[PDB]
């Protein structure tokens, strides 16, 4: 009847052999909430699928780090005029949380801001804008555009 398996794309450095890629796919498929993983050798992009009730997004980046790599990540803060309450936070969060290349983002329900942890590899500030424009709020960047 029920279950709900969500995807993510992510990026990791240290995969200088096919055996490194193999050990990510063969490693992630062991987590009890995970079903599947595929990682593109040389390009560095890891693509992972799980039931988020027992294994959620941050556990994937930590299980990748647990091989002895560096998960090639950055974080920034974003400012969200038009978020006014927890349901408003949840409205953008249910895209921002992972989009198609973000590792994690929890959206604030009173401070009108979100901490975004991501891979600076395959998307940018245009796609973040267009993901929030779809709900109807805006993005300004914390120091990096207007603050």
Curated annotation (Swiss-Prot):
Binding positions (Cu(+) 1): 17, 20
> Which cysteines are disulphide-bonded?
none
* Coiled-coil annotated spans: none
Q: Which residues of this UniProt protein bind Cu(+) 2?
A: 85, 88
Residue ranges constituting the HMA domain according to the UniProt record: 6-72, 74-140
Task: Give the induction text.
Answer: By Cu(2+).
Name its cellular compartments.
Answer: Cell membrane
Q: What else is known?
A: The copZA operon is activated by CueR and indirectly repressed by YfmP.
Q: What family classification does the UniProt entry report for this protein?
A: Belongs to the cation transport ATPase (P-type) (TC 3.A.3) family. Type IB subfamily.
Describe its partners and assembly state: Monomer at sub-stoichiometric copper concentrations. Homodimer at higher copper concentrations. Forms a heterodimer (electrostatic interactions) with CopZ during the transfer of Cu(+).
What the protein does comes down to:
Involved in copper export.
Q: What is this protein called?
A: Copper-exporting P-type ATPase
Its lineage reads: Bacteria, Bacillati, Bacillota, Bacilli, Bacillales
Protein's gene: copA
């Amino acid at each position: 009847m029920l279950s709900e398996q969500k995807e993510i794309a992510m990026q990791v450095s240290g995969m200088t052999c096919a055996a490194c890629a193999a050990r990510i796919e063969k490693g992630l498929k062991r987590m009890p909430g995970v079903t599947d993983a595929n990682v593109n050798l040389a390009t560095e992009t890891s693509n992972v699928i799980y039931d988020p009730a027992e294994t959620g997004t941050a556990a994937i980046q930590e299980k990748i780090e647990k091989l002895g790599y560096h998960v090639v990540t950055e974080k920034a803060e974003f400012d969200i005029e038009g978020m006014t309450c927890a349901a408003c936070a949840n409205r953008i969060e249910k895209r921002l949380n992972k989009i198609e290349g973000v590792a994690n983002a929890p959206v604030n329900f009173a401070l009108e801001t979100v901490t975004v942890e991501y891979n600076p590899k395959e998307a940018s500030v245009s796609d973040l804008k267009e993901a929030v424009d779809k709900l109807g709020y805006k993005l300004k960047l914390k120091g990096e555009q207007d603050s």
